């Protein structure tokens, strides 16, 4: 049993690959060949919000494309007005070092973790007029890398103790736990009708749970190196990953297996930050040599350059309305382009 | 109105950008250690009147190759070395080479003849300064160690980060702080 | 997907030769650091030797220094180590560990917890 099992794993595995690659009749690439591809899309730098002390490791912008918040590792949690560059609050957190940020889709709360294996919810819109920590989601035995609300009563949470949970928010325990990653969970993305979410860790492997369940239903391979980042393709059904190896994938969820890979030889930087476009088309990607890469994500061509800022892109987010993206960095600024 | 709920936005702004002036002046005054070697305990005591911040890692997992970038701007990491004594020759060789902590200054705290066997042909060098007590045995044992430590050091160190090398005090954490807070002054103005 | 398949082992006679072989998958060889770690029975992970991107900077640890010679060809994806005049306390598994980023000359690639970019080790008794 301690190696006769591990020669059934591997008999399972050659079987997943065989019918990964009897259905690969085609390449993502080949059928979109005769497309025309995407203009050499030049976007400028409109906002520069300053006031962060430290490095930038997260944002997250507000369902009405209008307030993001902003988690530096000084201790603070900013909340902008991207249109007036205004700072609407100002969250002083008990931990230092915070690695992750959330905005609710309400917009009545945002959550907050990193070293301290807390999950820190914060109303916005209190009744005596401050944000007060309403809960502390503990009991993670990991540094929270990603936590993404569901409502504004349930909020799943990556951790790098190889693990996600899923907590209800008023009582504060973990309704389901999702194990199965090697290595620190280090992203997690909500699909569109919040009914499935994937995760990569630092196994070079993605996962995609179900949040209602709480099983792994599909296991996606094909990084070499650690996954940083992960986002789901606006209808869902597909989505792309970043590793520490300089490449990202576009995996397909029906499909099973990777569709395209978007490497250049002169990019040795592992990726920091992946998001896309409110159509798909574009792949904006952060990496650790300062400076975002547009890409086609149907024909896997560099499209064009965010390069301002002058330290390594920690995060980047598009608008709901794919109407500016903005990045934060290493160099303590966010960066709005369009 | 669209001047009356601007004007309430920038009153509330000012009064923002205020506090984090104020939060400003705190955090430039502390100084943030590593100790290396809940989910994070924190330190904070005071040599002189200088504010210091020791983050013991706390309750991590043995994989330390993501959340160790999280400490790239700590003025010092202080790496106790108590085999376990090349594992810390390895541990220390992947902080000292890796690409986010290559500006960030090592204080290392020391706390075997067949685990090293260049250690027979190995004499303690004459600059050598021990306390009256020791026996040519430890003696010889505390310096080898330093030295195993320092050939990582001089390999790789470039003029951005230093190492501290000690035997076993706040004191001389005091005292290498201020050593890399001026070595890092002298660099901004090329004097070295 | 990142496979390491060790080969070689075996119990050997003290004093006798041996060579460990690593078959690497689903990576570029060329641009990682290939390491070698073993568990004595009993005891934890601790590291062996390592090797460059290219074979230039080798490095062993103090108790196979003269003995082990650890080796690899990039053009066909196979890190070697050579056990030479072993001994019985050289008795453990040995993985073929792999640090996880390419380009770079740190690695953290000893864990007690699971580590992912590494083998299912290969039995070496003395």
């Known amino acids: 049993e301690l190696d006769q099992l591990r020669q059934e794993a591997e008999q399972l595995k050659n079987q997943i690959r065989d019918a990964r690659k009897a259905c690969a009749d085609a390449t993502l690439s080949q059928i979109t060949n005769n497309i025309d591809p995407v203009g050499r899309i030049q976007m400028r730098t409109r906002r520069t919000l300053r006031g962060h002390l430290a490095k930038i490791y997260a944002m997250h912008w507000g369902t009405d494309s209008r307030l993001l918040v902003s988690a530096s590792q000084d201790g603070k949690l900013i909340i902008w007005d991207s249109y007036t560059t205004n700072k609407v609050h100002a969250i002083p957190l008990r931990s230092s070092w915070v690695m992750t940020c959330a905005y609710a889709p309400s917009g009545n709360y945002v959550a907050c973790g990193g070293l301290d294996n807390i999950c820190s919810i914060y109303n916005l819109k209190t009744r005596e007029g401050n944000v007060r920590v309403s809960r502390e989601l503990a009991g993670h035995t990991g540094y929270l890398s990603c936590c993404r609300f569901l409502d504004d009563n349930q909020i799943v949470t990556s951790s790098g103790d190889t693990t996600c949970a899923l907590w209800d928010i008023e009582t504060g325990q973990q309704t389901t736990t999702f194990t199965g990653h090697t290595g620190d969970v280090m992203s997690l993305s909500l699909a569109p009708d919040t009914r499935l979410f994937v995760s990569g860790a630092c196994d070079a492997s993605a996962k995609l749970w179900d949040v209602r369940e709480g099983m792994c239903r599909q296991t996606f391979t094909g990084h070499e190196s650690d996954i940083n980042a992960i986002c789901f393709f606006p209808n869902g059904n597909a989505f792309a990953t970043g590793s520490d190896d300089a490449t990202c994938r576009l995996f397909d969820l029906r499909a099973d297996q990777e569709l395209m890979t978007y490497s250049h030889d002169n990019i040795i930087c592992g990726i920091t930050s992946v998001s896309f476009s409110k159509s798909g088309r574009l792949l904006l990607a952060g990496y650790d040599d300062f400076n975002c890469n547009v890409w086609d994500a149907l024909k896997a061509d560099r499209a064009g350059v965010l390069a301002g800022h002058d330290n390594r892109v920690s995060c980047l987010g598009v608008t709901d309305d794919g109407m500016a993206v903005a990045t934060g960095s290493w160099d303590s600024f966010l960066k709005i382009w369009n | 109105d669209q001047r009356n709920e601007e004007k309430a936005q920038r009153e509330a702004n000012k009064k923002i950008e205020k506090q984090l002036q104020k939060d400003k002046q705190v955090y430039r005054a502390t100084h943030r250690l590593l100790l290396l070697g809940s989910g994070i305990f924190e330190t904070k005591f005071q040599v002189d009147k200088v504010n210091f911040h020791m983050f013991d890692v706390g309750g991590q997992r043995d994989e330390r190759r993501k959340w160790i970038q999280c400490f790239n701007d700590v003025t010092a990491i202080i790496f106790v070395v108590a085999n376990r004594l090349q594992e810390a020759l390895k541990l220390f060789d992947s902080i000292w080479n890796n690409k986010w902590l290559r500006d960030t200054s090592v204080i290392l705290f020391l706390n075997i003849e067949d685990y090293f066997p260049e250690f027979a042909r190995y004499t303690t060098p004459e600059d050598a300064t021990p306390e009256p007590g020791e026996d040519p045995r430890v003696t010889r044992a505390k310096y080898f160690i330093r030295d195993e430590f320092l050939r990582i050091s001089t390999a790789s160190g470039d003029g951005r980060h230093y190492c501290y090398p000690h035997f076993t005090n706040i004191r001389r954490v005091f005292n290498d702080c201020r050593d890399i807070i001026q070595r890092m002054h002298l660099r901004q103005y090329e004097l070295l | 997907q990142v496979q390491l398949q060790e080969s070689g082992g075996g119990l050997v006679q003290p004093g006798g030769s041996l060579r460990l072989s690593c078959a690497a998958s689903?990576?570029?060889?060329?641009?990682?650091?290939m390491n070698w770690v073993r568990q004595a029975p009993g005891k934890g992970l601790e590291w062996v030797s390592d090797?460059?991107?290219?074979?230039?900077?080798?490095s062993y640890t103090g108790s196979v220094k003269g003995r082990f010679t650890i080796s690899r060809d990039n053009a066909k994806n196979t890190l070697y180590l050579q056990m030479n005049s072993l001994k019985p306390e050289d008795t453990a598994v040995y993985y073929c560990?792999?640090?996880?980023?390419?380009?770079?000359?740190?690695?953290?690639?000893?864990?007690?917890?699971?580590?992912?970019?590494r083998g299912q080790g290969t039995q070496v008794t003395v």
């Open positions: 560990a792999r640090c996880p980023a390419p380009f770079t000359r740190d690695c953290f690639d000893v864990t007690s917890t699971t580590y992912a970019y």
């Open positions: 689903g990576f570029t060889f060329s641009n990682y650091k």
């Open positions: 090797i460059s991107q290219s074979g230039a900077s080798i």
